[PDB]
Amino acid sequence: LERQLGELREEFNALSQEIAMSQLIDLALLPLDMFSMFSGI
Amino acid sequence: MASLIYRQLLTNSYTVSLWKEMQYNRDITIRFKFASSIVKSGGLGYKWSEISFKPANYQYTYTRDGEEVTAHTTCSVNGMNDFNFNGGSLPTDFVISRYEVIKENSYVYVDYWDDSQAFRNMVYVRSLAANLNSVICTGGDYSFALPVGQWPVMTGGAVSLHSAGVTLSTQFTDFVSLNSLRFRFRLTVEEPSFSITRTRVSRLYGLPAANPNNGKEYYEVAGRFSLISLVPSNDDYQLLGELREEFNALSQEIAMSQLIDLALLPLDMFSMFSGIKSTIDAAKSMATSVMKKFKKSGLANSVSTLTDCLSDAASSISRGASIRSVGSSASCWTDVSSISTQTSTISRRLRLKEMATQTEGMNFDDISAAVLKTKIDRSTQISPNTLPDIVTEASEKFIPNRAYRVINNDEVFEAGTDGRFFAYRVETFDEIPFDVQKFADLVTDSPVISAIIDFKTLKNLNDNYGISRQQAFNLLRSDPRVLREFINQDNPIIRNRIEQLIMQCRL
Amino acid sequence: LPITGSMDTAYANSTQEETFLTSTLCLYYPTEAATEINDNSWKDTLSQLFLTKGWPTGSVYFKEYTDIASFSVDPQLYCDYNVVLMKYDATLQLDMSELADLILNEWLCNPMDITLYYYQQTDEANKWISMGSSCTIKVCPLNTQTLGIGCLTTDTATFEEVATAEKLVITDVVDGVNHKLDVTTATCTIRNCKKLGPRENVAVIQVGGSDVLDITADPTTAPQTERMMRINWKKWWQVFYTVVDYVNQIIQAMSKRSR
Amino acid sequence: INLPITGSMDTAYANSTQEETFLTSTLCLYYPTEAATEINDNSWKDTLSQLFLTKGWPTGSVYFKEYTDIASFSVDPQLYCDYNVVLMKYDATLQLDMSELADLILNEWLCNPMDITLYYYQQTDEANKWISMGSSCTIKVCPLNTQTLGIGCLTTDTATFEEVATAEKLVITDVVDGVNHKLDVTTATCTIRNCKKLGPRENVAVIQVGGSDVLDITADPTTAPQTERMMRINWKKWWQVFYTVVDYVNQIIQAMSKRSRSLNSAAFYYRI
Amino acid sequence: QNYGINLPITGSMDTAYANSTQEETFLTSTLCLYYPTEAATEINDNSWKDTLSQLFLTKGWPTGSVYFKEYTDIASFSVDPQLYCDYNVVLMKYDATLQLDMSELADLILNEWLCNPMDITLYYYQQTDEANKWISMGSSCTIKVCPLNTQTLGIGCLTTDTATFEEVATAEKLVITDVVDGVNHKLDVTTATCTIRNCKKLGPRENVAVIQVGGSDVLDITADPTTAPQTERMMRINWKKWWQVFYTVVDYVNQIIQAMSKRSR
Numbered sequence A: 001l002e003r004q005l006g007e008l009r010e011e012f013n014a015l016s017q018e019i020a021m022s023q024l025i026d027l028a029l030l031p032l033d034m035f036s037m038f039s040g041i
Numbered sequence B: 001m002a003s004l005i006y007r008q009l010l011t012n013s014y015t016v017s018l019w020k021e022m023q024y025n026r027d028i029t030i031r032f033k034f035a036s037s038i039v040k041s042g043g044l045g046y047k048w049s050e051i052s053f054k055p056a057n058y059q060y061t062y063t064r065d066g067e068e069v070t071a072h073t074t075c076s077v078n079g080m081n082d083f084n085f086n087g088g089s090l091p092t093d094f095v096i097s098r099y100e101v102i103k104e105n106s107y108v109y110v111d112y113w114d115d116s117q118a119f120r121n122m123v124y125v126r127s128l129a130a131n132l133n134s135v136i137c138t139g140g141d142y143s144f145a146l147p148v149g150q151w152p153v154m155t156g157g158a159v160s161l162h163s164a165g166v167t168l169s170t171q172f173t174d175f176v177s178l179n180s181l182r183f184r185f186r187l188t189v190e191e192p193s194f195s196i197t198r199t200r201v202s203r204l205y206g207l208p209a210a211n212p213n214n215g216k217e218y219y220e221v222a223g224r225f226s227l228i229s230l231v232p233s234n235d236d237y238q239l240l241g242e243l244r245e246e247f248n249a250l251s252q253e254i255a256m257s258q259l260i261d262l263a264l265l266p267l268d269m270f271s272m273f274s275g276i277k278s279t280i281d282a283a284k285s286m287a288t289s290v291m292k293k294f295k296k297s298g299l300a301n302s303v304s305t306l307t308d309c310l311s312d313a314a315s316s317i318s319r320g321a322s323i324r325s326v327g328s329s330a331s332c333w334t335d336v337s338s339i340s341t342q343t344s345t346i347s348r349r350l351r352l353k354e355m356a357t358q359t360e361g362m363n364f365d366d367i368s369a370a371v372l373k374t375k376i377d378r379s380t381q382i383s384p385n386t387l388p389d390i391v392t393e394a395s396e397k398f399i400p401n402r403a404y405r406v407i408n409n410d411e412v413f414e415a416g417t418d419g420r421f422f423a424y425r426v427e428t429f430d431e432i433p434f435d436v437q438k439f440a441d442l443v444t445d446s447p448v449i450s451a452i453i454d455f456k457t458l459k460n461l462n463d464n465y466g467i468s469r470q471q472a473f474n475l476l477r478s479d480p481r482v483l484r485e486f487i488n489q490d491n492p493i494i495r496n497r498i499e500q501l502i503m504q505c506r507l
Numbered sequence C: 001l002p003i004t005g006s007m008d009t010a011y012a013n014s015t016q017e018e019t020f021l022t023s024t025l026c027l028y029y030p031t032e033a034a035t036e037i038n039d040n041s042w043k044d045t046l047s048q049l050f051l052t053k054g055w056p057t058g059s060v061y062f063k064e065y066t067d068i069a070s071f072s073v074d075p076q077l078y079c080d081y082n083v084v085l086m087k088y089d090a091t092l093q094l095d096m097s098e099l100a101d102l103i104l105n106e107w108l109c110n111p112m113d114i115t116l117y118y119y120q121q122t123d124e125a126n127k128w129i130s131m132g133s134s135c136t137i138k139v140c141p142l143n144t145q146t147l148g149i150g151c152l153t154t155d156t157a158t159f160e161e162v163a164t165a166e167k168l169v170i171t172d173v174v175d176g177v178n179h180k181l182d183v184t185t186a187t188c189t190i191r192n193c194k195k196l197g198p199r200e201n202v203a204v205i206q207v208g209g210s211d212v213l214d215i216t217a218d219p220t221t222a223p224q225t226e227r228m229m230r231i232n233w234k235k236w237w238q239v240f241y242t243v244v245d246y247v248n249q250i251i252q253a254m255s256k257r258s259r
Numbered sequence D: 001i002n003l004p005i006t007g008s009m010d011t012a013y014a015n016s017t018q019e020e021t022f023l024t025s026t027l028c029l030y031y032p033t034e035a036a037t038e039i040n041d042n043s044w045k046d047t048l049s050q051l052f053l054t055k056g057w058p059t060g061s062v063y064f065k066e067y068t069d070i071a072s073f074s075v076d077p078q079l080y081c082d083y084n085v086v087l088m089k090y091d092a093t094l095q096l097d098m099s100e101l102a103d104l105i106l107n108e109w110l111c112n113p114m115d116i117t118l119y120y121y122q123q124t125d126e127a128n129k130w131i132s133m134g135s136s137c138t139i140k141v142c143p144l145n146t147q148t149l150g151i152g153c154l155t156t157d158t159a160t161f162e163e164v165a166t167a168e169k170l171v172i173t174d175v176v177d178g179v180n181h182k183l184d185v186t187t188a189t190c191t192i193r194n195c196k197k198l199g200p201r202e203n204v205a206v207i208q209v210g211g212s213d214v215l216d217i218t219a220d221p222t223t224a225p226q227t228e229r230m231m232r233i234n235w236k237k238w239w240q241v242f243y244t245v246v247d248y249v250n251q252i253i254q255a256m257s258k259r260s261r262s263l264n265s266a267a268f269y270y271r272i
Numbered sequence E: 001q002n003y004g005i006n007l008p009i010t011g012s013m014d015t016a017y018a019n020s021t022q023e024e025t026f027l028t029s030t031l032c033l034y035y036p037t038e039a040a041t042e043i044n045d046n047s048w049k050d051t052l053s054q055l056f057l058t059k060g061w062p063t064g065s066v067y068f069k070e071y072t073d074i075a076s077f078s079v080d081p082q083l084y085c086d087y088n089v090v091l092m093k094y095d096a097t098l099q100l101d102m103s104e105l106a107d108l109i110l111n112e113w114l115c116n117p118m119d120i121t122l123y124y125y126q127q128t129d130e131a132n133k134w135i136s137m138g139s140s141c142t143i144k145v146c147p148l149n150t151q152t153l154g155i156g157c158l159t160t161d162t163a164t165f166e167e168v169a170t171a172e173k174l175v176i177t178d179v180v181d182g183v184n185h186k187l188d189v190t191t192a193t194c195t196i197r198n199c200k201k202l203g204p205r206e207n208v209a210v211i212q213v214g215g216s217d218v219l220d221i222t223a224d225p226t227t228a229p230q231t232e233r234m235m236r237i238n239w240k241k242w243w244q245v246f247y248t249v250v251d252y253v254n255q256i257i258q259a260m261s262k263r264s265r
């Protein structure tokens, strides 16, 4: 068994807000292709 | 975009899937049966040479949850101990040289098989597990047929079968060979012991090897299994003569404004094969089916040959292929009225400039693919074996003649596969002698544009429907915005050209 | 749709003495009460009494029920105002709480096919309610690849028993795992039901001990609503006279359904 | 800490302490023997672990500490976990016992030993009680007067002492605060401690599996409160109780908060 | 009085050193000694406790602030040591065969461990840091370990045949086990007569004071074989009698209590 999706949403609510803005805007300018997106996770 | 789909087909050519990892979870009713082999020595009939077990096949048909399932079960034993009982050295005393008995140390094997899908092509399995319930198996009453004397009867004996590991096996026979599942069971002796009556043997445990079935028709135990196996994705393993006419009937019924609205969308593989209400097999293998034929055509071969000739023109230079080059020097983008001939020959590679991402405008192959996607969602006659090589005949025979242009310091040089060339100024449309050996040097490296708005209609428009500087620059640049604005302003000098493009997109 | 208003408007007249005339009332009393009373015209008597409060004679109904469990077995409450009288029994605490959880709340119920499908609960209000003469339910959770956890999908003995010989059951299990079930489908029918907004049309009245009903399956609220009332008793005529006299309070605590 | 703290109402701060520990929680259930008796299974602990895994708790975080009886559990309850849940069955003949257990585990106590013979003790405030634990504690108390004599009792005849505990394992005795008492206890089998009640223990949660709320945690009869971490259930089986607890453990965990004073294993601090 | 939180503290460098809290901390605190049975055996006196109390009374410590708590043996003391006082002293005899146990005792009492429980029948446990150890108490603990690989299979051991497990303890009353941090271990333990607890070593306990009576200092508190430190409250003496030792302790009880410091937790 993996999770209850309600509790996984609560894990998101634990990762609510704390993304930096310079870092987010620099992260959203990358071609995060399949390899990069499913390797590091 | 609509040519990017062709470029993507070419890119994913290496994929030209078939297998799959499927999960099966089904209930089953294991109705098995034992079998004994009673061998009787010669003499009078008081002496028994052996009483052993035998592999016991049983084939039957039972009712699942709304299914009528045919099945086949093969029982066997392993590690049974051998006991003996001698009453004397005479032919007239009841003696059993050897009889087999069951205890903890032994094991019971059961090969199980059905006619369902889980067993049709089971050759590879992993993550195998199973939930089985325990039962009790007891021996009956085997009366030793003594010609004369008393009647010894082997009676009693019970054992509790507890589940154990599962594996694979193969049931062989003189008729059929079945790739089956091997259910293994461990044993624990029960309270009722086995005993032969009118004989000095009693209060001993196990299961008698004489009549283990107890006169029953089978021993029924339910179970469930789960696995992950390999299976062909196609779940079955264990006649253009009229198509062209359908295309030419569907050609002009299609509209123009909405078609131009649709010819700007990157209708990638999903979007191109989603609106097709395909068959269960086509939806699984459509893309690879069309690709294995798309990389067989004049288009693909010409692309690969241009690439081979560019490689060979970069390498050969010391022995440089001197076939011909008008312009600066050999490029293989310009390889050859003489002027009209050269221009047509260069335009038969400007089609490759088009489907090489080195264009700026409506990129005629894009219009061709839009017509394709607008026709193959309407045409009733579309099928898995049918779309392959229709996509290619489309890509090959849509807009055979097509023109291009290049701009340099406000001077447009046109060209066409139909042997026509036109030089002219942007602001003031007036022809000029066509500057060959400069048009080539420019079209080679500078970007090219397509002739959707070609000079003839352009001049007719600049004459009748007087045109502004920005509108004319955008029409030279082949802008879909101004194109659709004219198409909504209902300009027949553009509607006619678009209708001509449709009628050339005929197949 | 949206609704506007204002605070400058005035309060309207009392809808009482008209809601009585254009509504119906339905009492649900136990056979014990009729027994202790031992009279044939007590219904006519109570209706003539209600007629003083304003409820006309052809508006009040009395619907006897032999036992709380027999009542919990498919209670067909179809009236514009329902009152229930409920005895207290420690041995029947969970049953008389499930009855409340069933009638006080309005349930959106779908059927269930155990033998053919396996089900799971999505939110905290998607429960499994079984009704019948004698229910005996057992549950086996499963994992991602349809294998049992402390149970066997085939061996019914290895299942976990949650109900035994219960006429009504309300089962909440862990929300996010697929369960297999074993139920006496012959004698009990089971539905998967999501709890909608409460039923403001029924009023439970506990005739005996302290307030024990815990509607909320979550053991943190334990709320006591407006239409879950209590009385201490030594006779039944006193209870019925109390109900009669304070019916207006009960009908102010209740509100006609919206559906 | 004495220093102050500041704040605001517009900000969205997001800046907070981050660190590591044992793996982000632990949980310990205290269930009666009767539950496993009714269940009659030897895989139900692992079943509940894999269930909790859906709610987020990893493998090595959930624990069960079976207890035979409420009194046996009251005898030296050693709680060392980051979250504690206590299922407790209802018995009208044990109300005082399972209210003393509640007042003991829910609240935080600071205890000093006591020497009955050599000294005579007294209470100062309404929170300085005398808790006695053991196997059979029979207590008797004689108040005294200003001149070190007795009041309705005699310093010599223990029979004249007034009895307050008979055949109890845990006793929590509150007497008149401001007078010297003389005590007689079965010191061989029980130990008595002068304890003072402090701020509550937010790490435990009681769950009355049965009847209505009766626990009067506050010895004064005027409050009769009921805390957030004092739950009730109606039960006919134990599997359904445990499934309920598991489906609603996030509310239990939102109602419980880790300790503040310190780490400790017993139900009270010792300060001599 | 903000408990449960940690705030920046502040001060200055112009404030003068305040008065001596000595002669008041002795009065409002308590001192508990832990001596061995051999001491009272050699002594053979019934009033030695009242004697040492009247001696402390000269140093300032009042009569009923001092406590003596005997223990027959270092192992019987290691079996669930319950040190609940405001200043604890522990006189410890040296035995080269008991070195490891009396070092585990030191690492257990000198420090303040945050201890969570453990259940071997269900789970398989792994360590996260170098201070998350497993301490086993009881009368005779026989602990065996089988590490597992990435795919839940043993390494040189089988998950059924307990005989193939690796033995680290053999009939020990106290054990403190550290293993490779990052790998799950399956355990065999005599749960009936021993309790194992997974504990994290937090900052030290400044409330106890070990005083070795005999041999050279050997106690390696820190499990890592790089520090081998000698803490401030780790004292040594050389002995031939016990009265001299107690007189030394009493005469230098102020240095001892200066080396100790009332707890934080």
Ligand SMILES: *[C@@H]1O[C@H](CO)[C@@H](O)[C@H](O)[C@H]1NC(C)=O
Residues within 6 Å of the ligand: B252, B253, B254
């Ligand atoms: C021919 O096409 C037009 C539109 O393109 C359509 O309206 C007409 O019905 C078609 N003819 C027949 C016979 O269907």
Ligand SMILES: *[C@@H]1O[C@H](CO)[C@@H](O)[C@H](O)[C@H]1NC(C)=O
Residues within 6 Å of the ligand: C013
């Ligand atoms: C409301 O009550 C007042 C006073 O009793 C009465 O005058 C009025 O007529 C009532 N409203 C209606 C609509 O009759």
Ligand SMILES: *[C@@H]1O[C@H](CO)[C@@H](O)[C@H](O)[C@H]1NC(C)=O
Residues within 6 Å of the ligand: D013, D014, D015
């Ligand atoms: C918290 O972090 C954000 C961004 O990192 C910052 O703007 C904010 O000032 C921080 N909070 C405080 C109290 O400084």
Ligand SMILES: *[C@@H]1O[C@H](CO)[C@@H](O)[C@H](O)[C@H]1NC(C)=O
Residues within 6 Å of the ligand: E019
């Ligand atoms: C601190 O010591 C000095 C010198 O001994 C003394 O004068 C002073 O009074 C002491 N402080 C207090 C508060 O008594």
Ligand SMILES: [Ca+2]
Residues within 6 Å of the ligand: C121, C123, C124, C125, C126, C127, C172, C173, C174, C175, D247
């Ligand atoms: Ca639920």
Ligand SMILES: [Ca+2]
Residues within 6 Å of the ligand: C150, C151, C157, C158, C159, C160, D041
């Ligand atoms: Ca089970």
Ligand SMILES: [Ca+2]
Residues within 6 Å of the ligand: C094, C095, C098, C166, C167, C168, C169, C170
């Ligand atoms: Ca029920």
Ligand SMILES: [Ca+2]
Residues within 6 Å of the ligand: D096, D097, D100, D168, D169, D170, D171, D172
């Ligand atoms: Ca008590």
Ligand SMILES: [Ca+2]
Residues within 6 Å of the ligand: D152, D153, D160, D161, D162
């Ligand atoms: Ca008296």
Ligand SMILES: [Ca+2]
Residues within 6 Å of the ligand: D123, D125, D126, D127, D128, D174, D175, D176, D177
């Ligand atoms: Ca008091």
Ligand SMILES: [Ca+2]
Residues within 6 Å of the ligand: E100, E101, E102, E104, E172, E173, E174, E175, E176
């Ligand atoms: Ca040791």
Ligand SMILES: [Ca+2]
Residues within 6 Å of the ligand: E127, E129, E130, E131, E132, E178, E179, E180, E181
């Ligand atoms: Ca370590």
Ligand SMILES: [Ca+2]
Residues within 6 Å of the ligand: E156, E157, E164, E165, E166
């Ligand atoms: Ca080994």
